[PDB]
Amino acid sequence: MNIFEMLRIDEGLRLKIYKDTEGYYTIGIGHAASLNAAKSELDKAIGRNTNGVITKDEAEKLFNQDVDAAVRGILRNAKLKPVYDSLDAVRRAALINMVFQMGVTGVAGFTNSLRMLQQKRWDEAAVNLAKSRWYNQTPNRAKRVITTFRTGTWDAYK
Ligand SMILES: [Cl-]
Ligand SMILES: [Cl-]
16 A cells, blocks of 8 residues: 555546536535636646546546645645654555645644654554534545554554
């Protein structure tokens, strides 16, 4: 398992623009954004007039771009970079997963959890991570991500 397979599980795959529960237009593997504005962003991202329908290959390329953006966001952030560097490969994926979902600023706001992860106090980190609005909003996913941070294994995704 790697970050790509993990996020694919958490984000699913859609080949036609869809409006999620919070009102955002989304497509591909968690590529989120009016509809005209959404299609404009998508067309620029894909490189053609898609009219809202794309191929699996295009979804994967977009996904690859979005994952790269999350990784670079972590590395360019003073609070997240040190934590990421200190983590093993599996826990690093959980951090990328969080950034992919909520953005760099959002994850950087998890002060207690970040400090605990840096100190390898996995259970303390898990306790703090669950005490969040993020967790309460998308709990099934948060539980998988937290279990990953806690154990350093892919158990929650198998
Ligand atoms: Cl926190
Ligand atoms: Cl919060």
